[PDB]
Amino acid sequence: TCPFYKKIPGTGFTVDAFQYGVVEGCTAYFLTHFHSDHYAGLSKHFTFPVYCSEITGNLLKNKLHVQEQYIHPLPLDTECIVNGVKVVLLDANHCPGAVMILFYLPNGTVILHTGDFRADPSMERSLLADQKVHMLYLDTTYCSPEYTFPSQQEVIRFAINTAFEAVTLNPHALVVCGTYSIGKEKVFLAIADVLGSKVGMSQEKYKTLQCLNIPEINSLITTDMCSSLVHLLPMMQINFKGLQSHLKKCGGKYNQILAFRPTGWTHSNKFTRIADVIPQTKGNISIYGIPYSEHSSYLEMKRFVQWLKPQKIIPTVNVGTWKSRSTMEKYFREWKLEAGY
Ligand code: NI
């Protein structure tokens, strides 16, 4: 059965609710982004209308073979009417095609569902600025002050300089980057660009990337591994055994691997600056964990909420334990009293 925090009251609508079978009285299913926890249940057999971004619609059609007659892509930043209710999709600053959804209920309530997001001050000048929001369904993944991490830009700077240094010292080093879902494409694209290489990858990952409307992409990616010095592998193969094995397969073209694992937060963020990050090394293999986040830090989340001043907040993440729930409500209250709404 569908949980309450995936239901939009006063509408026939649900959000990211595809694993519950037919939801009672749902006339349209919204999908915020193509990540498996969110799309779980969709397939070629799905026969209700799905509302999403253009990019999420490309992935539905090509990766999950959802039939075209049930995919309803909407433009961003545009007022649209769905089953008699005005909606707007806004960029979520998460992975490609990820949106937030603004619902204008017939009775005059306004609801913002963030989907998964990384809050940014640029959001303070979208269509959000123009009106009041009564209810916020909030991505609370890192809703605790221990969750600090650098900007995306600082992390990319670190990775580019690291990769460029290594390959200039050793023209026979291979760079490998781990992946398991869409998102974080900038890590491997920026490295391949500084090295003047294309990124090499499996046919299935190349297909996924071809759905994302990235400009000049035929210029940046390839399935010919032999011509590339930046390879993508599944995240699970980013360990000393998986990488030794990959190196065997390259047939003596390379004698060193420099590998990156983009994680979200890890506790080494509470002690270490990005400048100070060091790899784990075994022989001719090094592995860097880099804190490239596509979710709000605690401070970024707080700033967005204190700007928006919603009347009620409903968390969508970390909702399964009483200790989590209690902690989150305490921070929402602090934020409200500090800013005076
Ligand atoms: Ni996500």
Curated annotation (Swiss-Prot):
The keyword Amino-acid biosynthesis does not apply. GO terms for molecular function: 5'-3' DNA exonuclease activity; beta-lactamase activity; damaged DNA binding; zinc ion binding. It is found in: Nucleus. The keyword Electron transport does not apply. Keywords: Cell cycle, Cell division, DNA damage, DNA repair, Hydrolase, Isopeptide bond, Metal-binding, Mitosis, Nucleus, Phosphoprotein, Ubl conjugation, Zinc, Zinc-finger. Its main location: nucleus. GO terms for cellular component: fibrillar center; nucleoplasm. Expressed in brain, heart, kidney, liver, pancreas, placenta and skeletal muscle. May be required for DNA interstrand cross-link repair. Also required for checkpoint mediated cell cycle arrest in early prophase in response to mitotic spindle poisons. Possesses beta-lactamase activity, catalyzing the hydrolysis of penicillin G and nitrocefin. Exhibits no activity towards other beta-lactam antibiotic classes including cephalosporins (cefotaxime) and carbapenems (imipenem). Belongs to the DNA repair metallo-beta-lactamase (DRMBL) family. Binds constitutively to TP53BP1. Binds CDC27, which is itself a component of the anaphase promoting complex (APC). Binds PIAS1. This is DNA cross-link repair 1A protein.
